[PDB]
Structure formats: C-alpha cells, structure tokens
Amino acid sequence: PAPHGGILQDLIARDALKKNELLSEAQSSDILVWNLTPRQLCDIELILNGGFSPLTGFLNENDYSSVVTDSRLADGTLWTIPITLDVDEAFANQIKPDTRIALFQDDEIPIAILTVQDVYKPNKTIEAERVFRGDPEHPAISYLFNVAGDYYVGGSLEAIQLPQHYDYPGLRKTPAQLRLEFQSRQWDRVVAFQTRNPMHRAHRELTVRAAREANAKVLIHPVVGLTKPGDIDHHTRVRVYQEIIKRYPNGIAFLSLLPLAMRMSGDREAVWHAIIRKNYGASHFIVGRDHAGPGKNSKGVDFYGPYDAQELVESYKHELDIEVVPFRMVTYLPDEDRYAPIDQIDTTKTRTLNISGTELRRRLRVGGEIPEWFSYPEVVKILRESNPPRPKQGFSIVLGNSLTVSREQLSIALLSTFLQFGGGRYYKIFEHNNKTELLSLIQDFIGSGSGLIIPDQWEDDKDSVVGKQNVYLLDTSSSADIQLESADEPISHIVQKVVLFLEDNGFFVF
Amino acid sequence: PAPHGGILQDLIARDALKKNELLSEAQSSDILVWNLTPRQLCDIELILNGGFSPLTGFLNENDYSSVVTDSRLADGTLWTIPITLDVDEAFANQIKPDTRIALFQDDEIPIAILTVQDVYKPNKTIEAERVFRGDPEHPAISYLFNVAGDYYVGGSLEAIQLPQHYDYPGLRKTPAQLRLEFQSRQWDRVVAFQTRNPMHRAHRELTVRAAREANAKVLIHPVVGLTKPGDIDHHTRVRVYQEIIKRYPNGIAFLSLLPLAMRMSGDREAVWHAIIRKNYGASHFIVGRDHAGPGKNSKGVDFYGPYDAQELVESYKHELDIEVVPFRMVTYLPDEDRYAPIDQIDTTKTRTLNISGTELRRRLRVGGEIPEWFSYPEVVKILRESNPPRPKQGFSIVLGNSLTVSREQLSIALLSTFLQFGGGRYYKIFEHNNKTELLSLIQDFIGSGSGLIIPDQWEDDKDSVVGKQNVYLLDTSSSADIQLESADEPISHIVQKVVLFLEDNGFFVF
Ligand SMILES: [Ca+2]
Ligand SMILES: [Ca+2]
Numbered sequence A, B: 001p002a003p004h005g006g007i008l009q010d011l012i013a014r015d016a017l018k019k020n021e022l023l024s025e026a027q028s029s030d031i032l033v034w035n036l037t038p039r040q041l042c043d044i045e046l047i048l049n050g051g052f053s054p055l056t057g058f059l060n061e062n063d064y065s066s067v068v069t070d071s072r073l074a075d076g077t078l079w080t081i082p083i084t085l086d087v088d089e090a091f092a093n094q095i096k097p098d099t100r101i102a103l104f105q106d107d108e109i110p111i112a113i114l115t116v117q118d119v120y121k122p123n124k125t126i127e128a129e130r131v132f133r134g135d136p137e138h139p140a141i142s143y144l145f146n147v148a149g150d151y152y153v154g155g156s157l158e159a160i161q162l163p164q165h166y167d168y169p170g171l172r173k174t175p176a177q178l179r180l181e182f183q184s185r186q187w188d189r190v191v192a193f194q195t196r197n198p199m200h201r202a203h204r205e206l207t208v209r210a211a212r213e214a215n216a217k218v219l220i221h222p223v224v225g226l227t228k229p230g231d232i233d234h235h236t237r238v239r240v241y242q243e244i245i246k247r248y249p250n251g252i253a254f255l256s257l258l259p260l261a262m263r264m265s266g267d268r269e270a271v272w273h274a275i276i277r278k279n280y281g282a283s284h285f286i287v288g289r290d291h292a293g294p295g296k297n298s299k300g301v302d303f304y305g306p307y308d309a310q311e312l313v314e315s316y317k318h319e320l321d322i323e324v325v326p327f328r329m330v331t332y333l334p335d336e337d338r339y340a341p342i343d344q345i346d347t348t349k350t351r352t353l354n355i356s357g358t359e360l361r362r363r364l365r366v367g368g369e370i371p372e373w374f375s376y377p378e379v380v381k382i383l384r385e386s387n388p389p390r391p392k393q394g395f396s397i398v399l400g401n402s403l404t405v406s407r408e409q410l411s412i413a414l415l416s417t418f419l420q421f422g423g424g425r426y427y428k429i430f431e432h433n434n435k436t437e438l439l440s441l442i443q444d445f446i447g448s449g450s451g452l453i454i455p456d457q458w459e460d461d462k463d464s465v466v467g468k469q470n471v472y473l474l475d476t477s478s479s480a481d482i483q484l485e486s487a488d489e490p491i492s493h494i495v496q497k498v499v500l501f502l503e504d505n506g507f508f509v510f
C-alpha cells in the first residue's frame, strides 16, 4: 500500500545531492554536536529511511502533545508513539529555534543535521500515564524516567547517512529497498510477521497458514534494535530466523531485519507496528495476543489485556490502509502428527502438547531434550550454543567479608580442588582491588564459561558494575549463597561446602 | 566497472513507458509473429536486460561478419560470439528491412518488437570454422547445422517483457538489480565464478581463496539457460548452489542465476563471459582450465587447448575492464586435513585425494559412499535424489521381433515374476501400438523409476521418439541387450535370463 501520509519520506534519497555539503557542515568546528543514545539511533534510522513516514524529524511539542493525548500528529494523521530527541538541561540551554545541530553516532560518525523548531521540558508523569498506562514497572516508563533526557528538541532532519551497522549488511532492508525486493518478485500481497523472539515450529506453521488464507507471500520482519529487557540477543535470534526461513516452501518467504526500538507499549505499539510495516511495503499484518506486551508487573497484574492490541487496531481499521490478519496460534496434536489452531481443538477430547517459555528455559539450563515437534533441531542447536547448560556455564565464588581464615590459602585450595574435575572449564583467582576496569570483566569471564575465585568483596557502591548472574557469596550472613557455619570454619570443610553447592546447582557433573 | 561500451542497455527500463503501446502492437492482427526457440529466448533475455551491452538487438550482417572474422562488432567493440535471430526461409521471405515483427514466447507471450535492418543467409561453414574451430562434433556446430535456421534477421529491439520464468523468481537478477544488491551492501570489489556443474568442496575452497587474494566478495553466477548436452539439470544444480552458499563465511557471498545459453565455445566464450560478468557488475572474474570447453571429440582430441581460454582473455586484458583472477584449482591433503593449490603440492612426496567425474558418476550409479572431504553431505544427498542408484532406477524390457513364443504370456510371466521382488518399483505391461503419444511416455515412466514390459518393438522411424537410457532389447539378434538362445526358448528360461540380467545390472538387489 501507499506509505502512511502518502509519501515515503526516505530522507537519504531526498538529500542525496546534499551529502557532501551536510557532512562538511556536520564537521565544522562551530556547530553544536549531540551524540545519539542507543534508542535515538534506532529511532533516527526509521525516520531517515521513511520507516516512520510521515515523520521527517523528531516531534516538536505541538505534534507530541497531540500524539500523547489523541494518538495523532497535530494534523490528524494516526500516530500512537511519540518519537522525540531527549537531551539534558546542559545541552538544551545552548539551543534555540532555528539553531542547526549535528547528530552523531559514537561521537565520530555524522548522521544528520537537525534544524531546531522548539525545545521543551515535557511532563514525564502525563506521558507515562497517557501513552504507557502508568505502571512504574512498564519498561518504557522505567526508560522514560531513569534513562531519557528531561528536555525534548523538536525539529526537521536532513540526512547524511543511516546509523552504521557492520553485521547483517544484506538483511537490513530500508522501506524503499524492501519494496523493490517485493516488486522484482512480482509480490503484490505480503503478510508481515513481527517478532522479538526465537521462532519455533508453531510460528512457522502460523505464518504459512496466514499466507495461505490471505493469498499472500510471507515477510518475517524481526526487531533487531531495542526489544524487551532480558530477550535473547539479536545475533542468536537472527541465526534462528536464517535457519527457519529455510523451512518454508521455496519462494514463499523473505527475511528482512527491522532496526526498531520497541517501547513494549502493547495496543498503541501494535498500531505503530501496523503503520511501520505498511511503510515497509507489506499489504497485511498479523497482530498477536498481547502484541508487544511486556507481560505482568510485580503484583502479577497484566500491563495490557490480551486482546487490547487486536481491539485498538480493529478500531482504526478504516484508516490504516493495511489489512490485519486474525491471529490463530496453533498447537501440536501428538495422535494426529500435525498442528491445528488452538481455537479449533479440545471440547471433543483431543490430546495436545506444548512447551512454555519457562520449561524451554529449564531444559536449556539442564541440557535436556527439546522435541522436534516443538522446534526444529537446527534452531534448538543454536539456542543451546548461545545459552549453554550448567556444566558449561561460568560462575564466581566471592569470599565474603566475614571470613577470618586465610583468603590466599582458601583461594588456592578452591583453585587446586576445581582443577581436579574434568570438563574443560578455565579457572582463575581474580583480584579486582575494587577497580571498575577489573570489576566490569567479571561477567565477561562468566560469559566465557570460566570459574572465578574472588578473594574479597568489592565496595557496595560498585555493585552496579558487576552483574549478579552466577555470582555466589560465601559468607556467614544469612544472605550468603553458600553459608558458612562460622567465620573460621576449616578450609577443607569450606572447600567441600563450595564443591557440593556447585554440584547441586549443576556446574559440576560427576 | 562500467558496462561494456559504457552504457547498460537495459531495454526493459528504456522502454518502460512504451510497454502498453508495444504490447498492443505485438497483439495487432496484421503484425508478423516469430515464436522464439529455446536458445533465442536465452539470448533475447540477455540483450533486453543489458547483459549483452552494447548490443540492443540481434546482429545484422555487418556486425556479424566482423564478429566472425575479427571478434569485434563493426565499430571495433570487442565481442566474440555472434548473437543472431535464426529463422527458416518461409519466414525470411515475408520479411524486408524496416518491417516490424513481434517476437513471442510459447506462441502466447509477447516479448519484444524487432525492427528489421536486414535478412541474410550466412555461410554456416565459415561460421563453424572461424568461431567454433570446425569440428562437426562441437556442440555449437551440431546446433548450428541441425537446429539453427538458415537465415539471420538483423535488427533493433524494443522491449515488452523478459522471457517468463516461474522458478527461482528471487535469484534471477538482471544486471541493474545485481548492481543494486552489491551497492546496498557497499560491495565495490566482487569476483564472479562461472559454473554449469554441481559445486563440490574444491570449488567452495577455490572461490573463498580467490576472494581472499583479490580482497573481493564472492558472486556465484551459475548458468541456468542452455549448457552442455548431458549436464545435470539446472533445478538440481540450483539446489546444490543454494546449499553450498550456506557454507561460506556469513556475508562473503551472493548467489544469482545467469539465463545464458552457452555455446561451449572455449576461449571465445571465456572472453564473452568476462564481458557479461562485467555488465552484471563484477569487478573480477575467474577463467578456468579449459573454460567453457566441451571436452574431446570422438577421436579423443581436445576441442580446445586447456589454457587457450586463459591466454585469449589475457591478450585482451587491456580493454576488458574487468580483472581476471588466476585459476588455482585445489586438491585434498588427507594427512594434513586441508586443501591446497595443486600447483603448490607434490615434488616433496605429498599424499592427495580426488574423485573424478567418472568415479562420482559410478558411485551415484551403485549407491556408493561419497566422502565429506570431497563434497558436503547435503550436496551429495541432493545429487543422489536427482540421480538415484540402480535399485531405484526405472527400465524397460522390449520383447524383440524375433520372438515366436506368446508375447501376452511372456509379458504376464515377467510382470508376475517382478512383482515378487521387494523394493517398491512400480511395474506395467506397456502397449504403445507404435503411437507417438504413447512412445514418448516410455522415458517418463523410466524417469519415475518404473519397470515397463513392452510386448513389441516400435517401427524404426519412431526410434527418435524413445530415449535409449535403460531400455533393453530381448531378442535373438547379436545386437540384443538380453540375447535369446533361440526364438522359441521356453518362457521360464527367458524369464530367468531377464531377471539375472537385471540383477547383474543392479536393478534388483537380493
Ligand atoms: Ca529526570
Ligand atoms: Ca492475563
């Protein structure tokens, strides 16, 4: 269909003949420079390549206010997520309307020149409530208060280049490029599938069925910009998508990566997704159950209703100009060796099988079997490599402050003891001396599968520097992961406590 | 580099705004229509998409003569293979200069309108000698005399559409499209690999080494138009290329199919290939040993010298504008578990392993093991599926004219006997009654793995309708494949002769 607003705002194309000129200006000594943050880089790529058509810059207060309260740009164009350039006061103060500033990536690569229209301090309390529903635990609200700048700079953009990416050069198609890929294949009906997770057998099945019903080709369009905290890394996911696209009938599907920064904003995000896929050339779009939903908060309540997304999108159906295809999740029928829509089974007493996210996680943690009816083996293999089981995981044992036994001797005893076991894990007594440059390497060694023996705790104000995954405290305190009977417990008894704790937790298998 | 002659003659693009107009003219009742032959469709696709730049039509006698004797178009542009529209006298007679004719595909799809410049009867004796070296057994000479029309029609072309292909819509990139694929990846150095065969480990290794040495990305550019008689079908080959492109380091290679009709014209063809790859956007090209060579003739003499191609291309190096990369075929070193250039091994007593085409064919025929050091198992699997071993091959037993025993009873006895054996082969007593519509199905049943029992021979002037592969004559004549001791040999003795012949040839395994 036609881009949202009618014209694809591909600014790279629009400004092609101004590239040298804009680059020189961006590099002039007198121009103010703002280094884009990771989320701003995702957003600016989508504005610059027309993925956010009709947007041609970051929203000034006029459009922003209208999006916050009315889900529309000031001119009435449907638009549910505010895209703004958030900066701190020190920068906002040296800015005024008409000022032209250079926007860089990594303080080295000029990306665009922004012509300032306005500078404002938005009420982040109202934004959180009106756009993200108010729950302080909502990923977007957490970001909005703890990470985002307090000042928004509205303005028009002129393109120099899209944010630099060295991985997957072939798969990161812009809207113009994707439309040409579809055109060269004579594809005029394409149904897009959104995802920020690995794809299992059920997803392959549901997308092929969607294609069959809409008489459309398939576009697997995963998000590789920012997704939900804790999600599988995009490199692992892309490997999974590259593997699964090979399981579709030849010529039915195309894989392209979307550098979007999701807000995990449920229904409003679903509408935003529909618009973006339309800009990218899709004729149809699948809106999932709890689409773009961040789950439940700490008290167990849903941030969004499971069908809020499908209902909001349905309310705007007459002006979206992209067909939404009903979501028919499928499940496996052992006795029939096939998959069927969950809305069509049971009631007649029919056996079904499924593996939840929690169960999948468990199996990967213990190195357990994962059935081919659930996920293609080549996909499972990829997931195991990126998320190895306990016998292959790294860890750290921290000698707590309470210890009065020799820390040097206890560290040496632990190292010598661990070196007896087979397995191939690399071990090291690691002294950080409370230095950030050393503390930040702890998770790097753990991520490499190594076992670190840390002779002393770091100061509390350094905690934030060390991730807590697989880090265990050996101490007398009740908070200790491995509790000592006493501060001067004999070294040989301490060693045994540690070895048995590690075995009980799967790090050692005998 | 720049297209040959300086401008990409993409006629589809040039004539975009004349499509409706040309289509209507092509469909007018008064215009003369020529239905393109399979080779002409390969050639016209390359002219129309700019693959044959600077050509914009089929060569008139002026350019043709110059190509035949001087390897150049009349204006001096290097061009070694004549591309002409060959027709029969009946058609050539109703043609004259300035006449506009419609060129169709399958007598139904309008492809282009040709404005006639001239009509001529070339001396096919001189063409065969000057362009293809004169050997009546040269694939091109055989085609030139037995298939090609005796009259050539020179003229300029206006495009309606490229020849229709329903398979591999995604991989058949035109020169303009391929250049855009390279541009979107920022690839400015690309080395192209020509092939009309399956690719084994050695080819993957040689292309990656070429890429390393030329600091270029890899373009696997196989021919899928017309190749050498007897070659593996392009569907099987494309499956092999799709499988092997996955064995290159991520982001190093691109697969695109070339709808070229090779002439198997060695050195001249190698030069033509260099020009075509340049038109398609490649910066480098690999010229093989006996590149595009059809092998040896019946007397065992080479149609071309093994280095004639590399030498002819080297002679034109200063005007080709595409770098030719030296061909370094590799071989496997068992004791070192690696591949090395054959020009760098031995002399120092080094063990090497290789599997020739004859040996590979043998192994596929008997169902023998094919080592992973030679070819990736997934590739081997594809080749076995397309070329199944004897126990899975079809066949026909023809009851010869000499037989005086009951043909009905002997056919029934053979069928009942064959049905005892396991295996899954389907059997049928097949009466053709000398009808072409039935005779032409014999190889279709054999190709499906079936065993046919044919009660009588067809007339000699129908032989050409039935392929000879796996068709066996049971008769008293010395020419019989299964020789009868006498015309009235007892049915049970005949049955045993046939069963044992089939077992000896691998069709039955007990
Ligand atoms: Ca703040
Ligand atoms: Ca719920």
Ligand SMILES: [Ca+2]
Pocket: A486, A488
């Ligand atoms: Ca004590």
Ligand SMILES: [Ca+2]
Pocket: B145, B149, B150
């Ligand atoms: Ca003739």
Ligand SMILES: [Ca+2]
Pocket: B302, B306
């Ligand atoms: Ca030779």
Ligand SMILES: [Ca+2]
Pocket: B486, B488
């Ligand atoms: Ca007799």
Ligand SMILES: [Mg+2]
Pocket: A045, A162, A163, A164, A165, A172, A259
């Ligand atoms: Mg980018």
Ligand SMILES: [Mg+2]
Pocket: B045, B162, B163, B164, B165, B172, B259
């Ligand atoms: Mg075609």
Ligand code: NA
Pocket: A106, A107, A108
């Ligand atoms: Na820097």
Ligand code: NA
Pocket: A304, A305, A308
């Ligand atoms: Na709700």
Ligand code: NA
Pocket: B106, B107, B108
């Ligand atoms: Na017809």
Ligand code: NA
Pocket: B304, B305, B308
């Ligand atoms: Na020679």
